């Protein structure tokens, strides 16, 4: 089991770490059918999604997808500094796998 | 996959973007039967619903509807600035499909 | 579809609007069997319940009942001003159907 | 239907009211098997639990037990004043049945 | 039933109490498949996980695992002082069983 986000991220293909060290600039949320997702941006233009749940996701990920959207909303609203995101870079926008906050 | 609320909104018929750049003026919530909904207003009188769940919604939308009501309540209580809403304009009041927050 | 609490409240028998324009004075919560409910008061002694879920409620109301208790707790803890309550006045204490928050 | 915590408490056997009029001093939470519970204390050493869900509970209490743990956590973090607890005094520590928050 | 985290912790094999008396320094969570988990650190380098749910857990632990991650996120965001953690020391990083918060 990994001890940090960087090591975690390295366990998977198709991923990378972004080091933001910044608060979330915007938070977008949709309930529209087939677009039940969240999008965040940072001041530098970096844009990330929490993907629409699909066949790329196993059943054990479903609660964690919902948690992640909860986390991004409250991080946005508290201006919490995001340290890193682990993302899948085979999606556009890049798709969030993990987040770390330290500040 | 869209990267922002404007492009997301354009994927659908009967939708329009409202650009508010303002906090929510009022938040209303009902548990009464057949009116299990939320209503928000802005100071300019713009009025929006989160629809009662119904046969227009697919299963994947049901958690998202609940999330959106959570988001609107906490946005209201934090006086968070709402940037845009994507709404269905074939409902009265207009029905929320997506929200963006930026400030 | 209604656009405000007053019009929503008027769709139901045995209801009334209370105009409070005040924060919640006390919040009570019970997990005791057959009394799984919330009670709120205002400074003037006005007392309201969220009813114990029962056969008077249709299935769609169940989630809305839980939401309303969440809303009352966070409204209490943020000292949010309650504008109006729509209540059923054939219950003692009067039972909450809807809430509006504004200044 | 009762209108306050005192009257509610008096509907049950083996209960008593504690009048605390104080914030929660400590909040403890366990996920250990058969000990999935919360424990609070006050500065005077008064110690209370939210019981592990068990055969003493009816099904309608299950959501309310979860809600109570939610309430205690946020009350602790907001330094909210606890007015009274209704507890079962046939449990060690005394088991929470209901809570009131006020000044 | 135990009355404090130390006594609870002692009911289990392979556990120990860490006394931190400090805020959480970093919070990490993941939605990646098979790593649906959270990791926290303290300034002294102490690193702890909330384990991925698995066959080592009983059903009552499922909700408690989700609660614990909720608690760690809000404790982080409120800078709440963590008093003690009860952890399993047969996992790397040590796995959280219980948390206490106090000053
Ligand atoms: C179009 C937009 O909204 N933003 C782009 C930004 O891309 C977005 O954010 C990235 C992280 C990714 O999720 C994209 O899918 C998304 O549209 C661009 O970022 C570059 O993205 C490419 C992938 O298109 C590579 O990943 C590259 O490393 C990224 O550029 C870096 O990150 C940027 C935020 C800047 O810091 C840039 O200087 C870096 O080179 C950028 C490219 O300028 O343009 C908009 O911001
Ligand atoms: C309670 C009320 O009557 N308020 C009106 C407002 O209507 C309400 O809000 C809109 C957004 C919609 O949901 C209505 O169903 C609801 O009653 C009026 O809004 C205009 O309505 C039309 C047709 O519905 C369009 O939606 C239009 O975009 C709305 O105007 C926009 O919002 C206004 C508040 C202005 O900022 C205007 O420039 C925008 O285009 C408006 C105007 O008639 O007046 C009250 O606010
Ligand atoms: C704890 C207490 O005795 N408070 C009373 C309040 O009664 C409570 O709150 C009302 C809304 C209801 O849920 C009652 O069952 C509950 O005990 C009194 O409110 C009046 O209550 C009588 C019934 O005993 C009638 O329901 C009457 O309509 C209520 O008054 C209206 O609402 C008040 C809060 C004010 O807006 C008043 O001007 C209204 O006419 C009130 C008033 O007697 O006194 C304490 O607050
Ligand atoms: C950790 C500890 O020993 N604290 C005690 C407290 O006991 C704890 O809190 C009470 C409410 C109950 O949940 C206990 O199981 C728990 O250990 C003591 O309270 C008394 O506890 C004894 C058992 O030792 C009896 O249960 C008794 O009823 C409790 O006293 C009542 O509650 C107190 C908080 C006071 O209001 C007292 O007047 C009440 O009768 C107290 C009492 O000495 O001391 C520490 O806080
Ligand atoms: C490597 C790193 O990131 N941190 C180490 C820390 O280990 C981490 O945290 C501990 C609690 C455990 O979860 C590890 O798996 C994890 O990598 C080290 O902590 C000691 O780790 C050993 C066995 O690895 C024991 O768990 C021991 O209790 C730990 O030491 C206690 O906690 C420390 C932070 C110190 O305060 C120490 O005095 C305590 O005994 C420490 C070694 O000090 O170093 C990094 O922080
Ligand atoms: O679990 C989610 C992930 O699934 C992978 O198969 C896919 O390559 C990633 O882009 C991401 O969607
Ligand atoms: O998914 C929800 C949407 O469903 C559409 O069919 C409908 O026209 C919209 O008004 C909205 O209700
Ligand atoms: O939805 C529940 C409501 O149902 C009505 O039939 C009843 O008269 C109200 O008091 C309220 O309980
Ligand atoms: O509903 C919970 C309560 O049920 C009672 O029967 C029991 O005596 C109490 O100690 C408490 O557990
Ligand atoms: O309940 C969770 C615990 O289960 C035990 O059997 C295991 O030894 C611990 O490491 C921990 O996983
Ligand atoms: Ca700021
Ligand atoms: Ca800080
Ligand atoms: Ca203000
Ligand atoms: Ca305000
Ligand atoms: Ca701000
Ligand atoms: Ca105040
Ligand atoms: Ca206060
Ligand atoms: Ca303080
Ligand atoms: Ca404090
Ligand atoms: Ca600080």
Author numbering:
A (entry chain D), B (entry chain C), C (entry chain B), D (entry chain A), E (entry chain E): 1 to 103
Can you quote the paper on this entry?
In response to environmental stimuli, the bacterium produces and secretes its main virulence factor, the cholera toxin (CT). CT is an AB5 protein toxin, which consists of one toxic A-subunit (CTA) and five identical B-subunits arranged in a doughnut-shaped ring (CTB). The primary receptor of the cholera toxin is the GM1 ganglioside, which is expressed in distinct membrane microdomains of small-intestinal epithelial cells. There are two major biotypes of V. cholerae, classical and El Tor, which produce cholera toxins with a slight sequence variation (cCT and ET CT). cCT and ET CT differ in only two residues of the B-subunit, His18/Tyr18 and Thr47/Ile47 (classical/El Tor).
Moreover, no previous toxin structure has been reported in complex with the blood group H determinant, which is characteristic of blood group O. The crystal structures of the cCTB and ET CTB complexes were determined to a resolution of 1.1 Å and 1.5 Å, respectively. Both proteins crystallized using the same conditions, but in different space groups (P212121 and P21). Since H-tetra-BGA is an almost symmetrical molecule, the fucosyl residues are indistinguishable. As for the complexes with A-penta-BGA, the fucose near residue 47 is most tightly anchored to the toxin, while the other fucose is loosely bound, by indirect water-mediated interactions. In addition to the ligands at the secondary binding site, the two structures of cCTB contain Gal monosaccharides in the primary binding site, which shows that the toxin can bind ligands at both binding sites simultaneously. Galactose is presumably a remnant from the purification by D-Gal affinity chromatography.
